[PDB]
Design a protein around this ligand. Structure first.
Ligand code: NDP
Ligand code: NCA
Length: 350
């Protein structure tokens, strides 16, 4: 009846950097009391995501995300299997997900807060529902469709920052699926650069820690940049914007280089860069995937189809054990992941 759970131990501060120690794992007893409409689930996988950085602050800065509470269990995207149900629409063995899954090994939840998933959409890789066939992938798809202005055969050049992460590795491929002739990725390591061009189909890759970014954009985007799928903001984006074309579009996915600072989101561009934006009529609007829930079902089917068609390559990085949730979040925030960071909590499904 003993389970492990992760609680928020301390807050780093809006200007601080997150560390594994901000999280603490403890044991609690799960009273075997399952009531009408509740189910008991065994957690299989949990996600860690950049937005969780905002939940670590007392104030998140937006109505759509609530702050985590000190000493209370943390929660986020999760996938699990139902071990017992007293909910009339859920059965033992069903696989389910929630965007508010407690970081705990076994949980008793209200069946109405869960969504039953279909394994065949992901060829049995349930963790994909937390990534490419889930919110990150929907964010890339919907962001490109809504903000990218790409048409088949316009021969536009797309640059993707955070290119080897969950949203960015998916965004680059979709840019090719939908019409961009050239897709260039910017990422933090040599190893990621290699994967971008050798496996994910990117035309070129730029390592921002070791290359002269401006020099490499000029060499790999000889015609300028028409669409920038921005995951990072900061200096990298100032550089990309510098080479963006008239009437180009920034899909403002996120600005992770700024998440450990108290600047409101999204940060403004500096005077000189905003001047370029205004002179060249570059569009930079906010994009929040939660504003498009009505596009979710068909987005998931589209992402699933591309995957089943052999076109979309889905990458993930796995860390094991609930005791490593904190380290996994810290690792993903600092570049340890290729693709979607996932934490495997259990494989027990019988
Ligand atoms: N608009 C929306 O609704 C949504 C937005 N997002 C946003 O998309 C972005 C990517 O999210 P996601 O794909 O889940 O996570 P990723 O898998 O991309 O993981 C984060 C990556 O960010 C990179 N990074 C971290 N710090 C910096 C830094 N200081 N400068 C440059 N790159 C950095 C790291 O890779 P590297 O080694 O290359 O530095 C790291 O692996 C985030 O900004 C997130 O907020 C996600 C979902 C929805
Ligand atoms: N900005 C983000 O990364 C984000 C992700 C999911 C929900 N809200 C915000």
């Amino acid at each position: 009846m003993i389970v492990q759970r992760v609680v928020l131990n301390s807050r780093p501060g809006k200007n601080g950097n997150p560390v594994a120690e901000n999280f603490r794992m403890e044991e609690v007893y799960l009273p075997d009391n399952i009531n009408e409409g509740q189910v008991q689930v065994r957690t299989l996988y949990l996600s860690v995501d950049p937005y969780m950085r905002c939940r670590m602050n007392e104030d998140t800065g937006t109505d759509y995300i609530t702050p985590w509470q000190l000493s209370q269990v943390v929660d986020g995207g999760g996938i699990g299997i139902i071990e017992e149900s007293k909910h009339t629409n859920l059965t033992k063995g069903d696989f389910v997900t929630s965007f508010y899954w407690p970081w705990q090994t076994k949980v008793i939840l209200d069946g109405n807060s869960l969504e039953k998933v279909d394994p065949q959409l992901v060829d049995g890789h349930l963790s994909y529902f937390l990534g490419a066939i889930g919110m990150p992938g929907l964010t890339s798809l919907i962001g490109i469709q809504e903000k990218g202005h790409i048409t088949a055969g316009s021969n536009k050049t797309m640059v993707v920052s955070g290119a080897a992460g969950a949203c960015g590795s998916v965004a680059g491929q979709i840019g090719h699926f939908l019409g961009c002739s050239r897709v260039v990725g910017i990422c933090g390591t040599h190893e990621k650069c290699i994967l971008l061009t050798s496996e994910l189909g990117f035309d070129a890759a730029i390592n921002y820690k070791k290359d002269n970014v401006a020099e490499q954009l000029r060499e790999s985007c000889p015609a300028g940049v028409d669409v920038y799928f921005d995951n990072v903001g900061g200096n990298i984006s100032d550089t990309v914007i510098s080479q963006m074309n008239e009437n180009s579009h920034i899909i403002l996915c996120g600005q992770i280089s700024q998440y450990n600072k108290d600047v409101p989101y999204p940060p403004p561009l500096s005077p000189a860069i905003e001047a370029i934006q205004k002179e060249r009529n570059i569009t930079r609007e906010r994009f929040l995937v939660l504003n498009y829930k009505d596009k979710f079902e068909p987005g998931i089917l589209q992402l699933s189809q591309w995957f089943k068609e052999g076109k979309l390559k889905i990458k993930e990085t796995v860390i094991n054990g609930l005791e490593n949730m904190g380290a996994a979040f810290q690792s993903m925030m600092t570049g340890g992941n290729i693709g979607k960071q996932i934490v495997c909590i259990s494989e027990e499904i019988s």
